[PDB]
Amino acid sequence: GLFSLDRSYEEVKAAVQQLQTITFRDATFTIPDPVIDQHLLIDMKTACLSMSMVANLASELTMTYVRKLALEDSSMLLVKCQELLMRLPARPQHVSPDDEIARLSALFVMLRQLDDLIREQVVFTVCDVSPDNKSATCIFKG
Amino acid sequence: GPETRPGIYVLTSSIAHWQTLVDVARGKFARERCSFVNRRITRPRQIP
Amino acid sequence: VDRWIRHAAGVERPQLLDTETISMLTFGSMSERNAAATVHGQKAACELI
Amino acid sequence: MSLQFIGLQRRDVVALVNFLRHLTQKPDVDLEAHPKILKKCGEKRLHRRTVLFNELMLWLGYYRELRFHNPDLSSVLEEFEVRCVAVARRGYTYPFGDRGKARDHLAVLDRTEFDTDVRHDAEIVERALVSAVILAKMSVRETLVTAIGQTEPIAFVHLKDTEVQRIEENLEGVRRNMFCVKPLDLNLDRHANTALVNAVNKLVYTGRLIMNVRRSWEELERKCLARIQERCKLLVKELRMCLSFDSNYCRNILKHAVENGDSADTLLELLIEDFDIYVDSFPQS
Amino acid sequence: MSLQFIGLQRRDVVALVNFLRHLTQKPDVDLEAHPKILKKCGEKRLHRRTVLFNELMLWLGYYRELRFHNPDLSSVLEEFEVRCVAVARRGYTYPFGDRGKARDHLAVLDRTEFDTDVRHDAEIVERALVSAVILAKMSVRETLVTAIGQTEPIAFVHLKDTEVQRIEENLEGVRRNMFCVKPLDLNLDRHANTALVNAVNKLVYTGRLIMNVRRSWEELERKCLARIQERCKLLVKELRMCLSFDSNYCRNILKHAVENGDSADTLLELLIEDFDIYVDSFPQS
Numbered sequence: 001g002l003f004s005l006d007r008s009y010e011e012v013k014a015a016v017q018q019l020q021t022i023t024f025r026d027a028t029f030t031i032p033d034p035v036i037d038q039h040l041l042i043d044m045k046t047a048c049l050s051m052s053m054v055a056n057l058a059s060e061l062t063m064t065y066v067r068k069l070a071l072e073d074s075s076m077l078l079v080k081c082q083e084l085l086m087r088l089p090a091r092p093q094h095v096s097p098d099d100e101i102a103r104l105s106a107l108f109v110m111l112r113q114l115d116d117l118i119r120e121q122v123v124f125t126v127c128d129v130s131p132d133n134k135s136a137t138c139i140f141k142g
Numbered sequence: 143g144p145e146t147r148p149g150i151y152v153l154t155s156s157i158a159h160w161q162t163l164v165d166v167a168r169g170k171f172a173r174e175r176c177s178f179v180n181r182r183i184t185r186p187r188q189i190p
Numbered sequence: 191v192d193r194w195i196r197h198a199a200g201v202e203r204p205q206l207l208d209t210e211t212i213s214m215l216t217f218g219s220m221s222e223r224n225a226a227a228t229v230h231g232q233k234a235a236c237e238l239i
Numbered sequence: 240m241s242l243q244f245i246g247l248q249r250r251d252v253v254a255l256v257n258f259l260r261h262l263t264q265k266p267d268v269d270l271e272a273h274p275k276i277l278k279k280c281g282e283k284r285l286h287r288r289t290v291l292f293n294e295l296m297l298w299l300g301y302y303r304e305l306r307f308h309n310p311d312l313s314s315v316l317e318e319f320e321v322r323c324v325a326v327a328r329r330g331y332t333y334p335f336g337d338r339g340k341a342r343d344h345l346a347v348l349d350r351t352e353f354d355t356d357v358r359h360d361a362e363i364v365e366r367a368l369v370s371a372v373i374l375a376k377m378s379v380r381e382t383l384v385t386a387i388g389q390t391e392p393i394a395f396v397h398l399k400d401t402e403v404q405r406i407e408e409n410l411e412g413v414r415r416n417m418f419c420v421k422p423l424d425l426n427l428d429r430h431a432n433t434a435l436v437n438a439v440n441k442l443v444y445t446g447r448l449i450m451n452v453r454r455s456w457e458e459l460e461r462k463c464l465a466r467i468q469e470r471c472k473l474l475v476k477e478l479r480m481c482l483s484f485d486s487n488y489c490r491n492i493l494k495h496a497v498e499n500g501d502s503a504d505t506l507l508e509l510l511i512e513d514f515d516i517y518v519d520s521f522p523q524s
Numbered sequence: 525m526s527l528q529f530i531g532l533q534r535r536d537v538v539a540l541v542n543f544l545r546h547l548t549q550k551p552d553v554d555l556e557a558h559p560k561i562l563k564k565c566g567e568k569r570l571h572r573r574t575v576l577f578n579e580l581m582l583w584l585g586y587y588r589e590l591r592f593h594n595p596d597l598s599s600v601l602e603e604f605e606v607r608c609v610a611v612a613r614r615g616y617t618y619p620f621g622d623r624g625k626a627r628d629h630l631a632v633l634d635r636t637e638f639d640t641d642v643r644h645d646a647e648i649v650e651r652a653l654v655s656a657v658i659l660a661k662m663s664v665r666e667t668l669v670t671a672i673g674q675t676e677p678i679a680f681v682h683l684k685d686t687e688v689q690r691i692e693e694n695l696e697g698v699r700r701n702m703f704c705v706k707p708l709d710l711n712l713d714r715h716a717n718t719a720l721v722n723a724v725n726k727l728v729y730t731g732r733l734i735m736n737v738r739r740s741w742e743e744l745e746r747k748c749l750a751r752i753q754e755r756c757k758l759l760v761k762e763l764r765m766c767l768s769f770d771s772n773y774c775r776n777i778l779k780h781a782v783e784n785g786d787s788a789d790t791l792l793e794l795l796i797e798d799f800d801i802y803v804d805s806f807p808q809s
Binding site for chain 2: 333
């Protein structure tokens with residue numbers, strides 16, 4: 001729904017095609033009619049609301065930290081993730097442990113506000129799956 | 143501004159799922175939701 | 191230089207995009223998929239300069 | 240364009256030809272405000288036909304120039320959008336005692352523009368300004384009108400009399416000389432109130448500056464047509480008494496309606512090429 | 525520091541030095557724009573070796589004053605930086621018939637930046653113009669060209685032919701004079717045109733002002749560099765006819781490659797400081 005905005009309708013089909021497929025866990029999957037809906041418009045609303053405030057709640061030492069780690073450490077995850085970012089020793093501008101611990105505590109709330117929209121009400125907690133893979137025991141149901 | 147008042151409510155509802163519950167909750171409480179972002183823009187270096 | 195290195199050994203990038211399996215790949219997991227056909231069974235060989 | 244006259248001396252002509260170039264610098268933009276120019280008409284010293292006709296070339300010449308100059312909306316009209324962008328931006332910020340009622344006041348303030356037509360530009364300021372003044376009192380929680388049918392008069396909030404005595408002079412001095420273009424960007428900012436309320440007083444004053452020049456544009460153009468129409472009908476009875484090929488032709492020129500711009504400009508352009516065919520009707524010397 | 529010459533009279537040098545002291549004040553800043561300066565060289569009247577020298581001292585002193593003055597695009601560039609993004613905020617507020625196409629030029633305009641390298645400034649303006657005129661046509665709803673590989677021409681839109689003739693005429697002197705810019709041509713504000721179109725018209729007016737200076741600076745500098753080596757390729761052969769010490773001593777100064785103006789900065793002071801030893805090598809009187 002984010003790509004569908006602000007872009008040509010013919011371009012949307014190129015994105016819906018690669019996104020409707022899901023090759024997760026061996027078996028392939030596909031999404032029937034992912035029509036845009038007002039139910040998405042409110043789902044996009046809570047995500048767009050979280051999309052902004054987390055940038056405000058983020059500490060100056062937090063968002064900067066990924067750009068600074070590349071100066072010394074190097075790793076596979078550091079390189080593959082760095083390409084997604086825009087292209088652009090030194091003292092911290094300020095360090096206030098009480099002010100900084102407060103910035104993080106508020107930051108967790110918006111994450112739960114944002115993470116939950118992809119989360120679902122968990123219902124099962126399977127233990128020992130049957131060998132046939134046609135049945136399994138469950139707990140926490142409801 | 144001067145003070146953040148508590149606003150207690152008891153709210154029975156047939157809804158049980160957390161996703162469906164919070165969504166309808168934003169209609170009745172949209173005004174207080176507007177107050178939250180408003181406190182942020184007015185007060186840099188303050189994080190309610 | 192790293193692009194020339196992985197192409198030299200032929201090793202693929204872990205993925206063109208960062209799935210959670212890629213973070214799981216650094217967590218410790220069976221990185222290699224099973225071959226499409228294995229008439230010879232299990233294979234192994236190490237190295238000592 | 241090419242004004243012409245009968246009984247005027249050559250010295251009287253140069254004073255009128257210079258009136259075109261010198262009109263922009265003149266204090267008090269009103270021919271009624273400068274009687275001495277009308278005392279050059281030669282009244283009570285020449286025949287009434289030549290005298291009453293003498294004003295018509297001057298009133299049309301006074302009319303041809305005012306449209307030729309146009310109000311100098313220039314950058315100043317663009318400046319109204321600049322301060323309006325600041326008040327519109329801060330209206331999403333400051334909390335109020337309502338929500339959906341102030342919501343319409345902000346969006347209508349965001350709809351403000353400037354029409355391609357020049358006459359209709361006043362209609363946008365006439366409504367967008369009233370929507371902004373109401374917003375400033377809400378920050379003060381000042382009482383708003385509830386009586387049916389009343390629109391709130393323009394009134395600056397929380398400004399000292401030390402500027403009020405002089406700020407009206409700028410609204411009156413620009414009204415005194417519509418050609419003048421004063422930005423009038425004094426130290427409007429104050430420590431009092433807040434950045435939103437101070438932005439409103441900077442903006443509400445800009446709308447009064449446009450409305451005064453706009454009403455002045457119709458204060459003369461609508462008025463001069465009422466005067467030319469008055470001089471025209473009075474001229475009809477005087478020319479009618481004589482029966483001649485020129486005396487009757489002069490009555491035909493007056494048949495055209497004074498109303499509207501181009502229809503009034505047509506009265507002069509038709510008279511320029513035909514000035515000599517009827518000149519014999521007017522006594523000279 | 526003083527320029528040196530062989531047989532030229534003192535009456536001629538004063539006309540040449542004043543041409544350099546006030547070259548920015550003079551209309552049309554170009555040597556080919558003043559053929560009479562080459563008539564002061566003593567061409568044909570003097571020996572061809574001296575003719576190459578009387579010119580070579582001018583090409584070094586003409587290039588030196590350009591490097592010494594140096595056009596200040598950065599002041600106008602700061603105004604271009606503010607007008608740049610200001611156009612972009614109007615674009616988000618303005619609905620389009622294709623929401624996705626509009627960002628492709630706006631995203632480049634939001635990416636705008638100014639690297640210290642002035643070589644790319646001719647390219648920086650180009651994407652600023654591709655993001656400009658193509659966007660303004662979408663507001664007018666006139667069809668954009670669909671031909672492959674054909675970037676739209678950049679010019680002012682929807683102006684009167686008398687208006688296009690005036691504001692464009694200033695750009696012709698911007699090539700002739702990159703220093704003393706004299707804009708003062710401001711009446712492009714809306715009145716009739718859409719407000720987003722007006723900022724694009726001022727945007728093209730700034731972008732045409734930049735490209736005309738950076739191109740003339742790149743051209744006049746590249747032009748003098750070729751003319752200097754042409755003086756060397758001929759003079760080294762003309763000096764081959766004689767093997768006198770002073771005739772050969774000049775060739776050692778010419779051994780340096782004259783790539784860019786960097787070697788010329790050493791070539792000029794060295795040629796003047798040691799000029800006295802070989803002044804008699806050139807025939808005179």
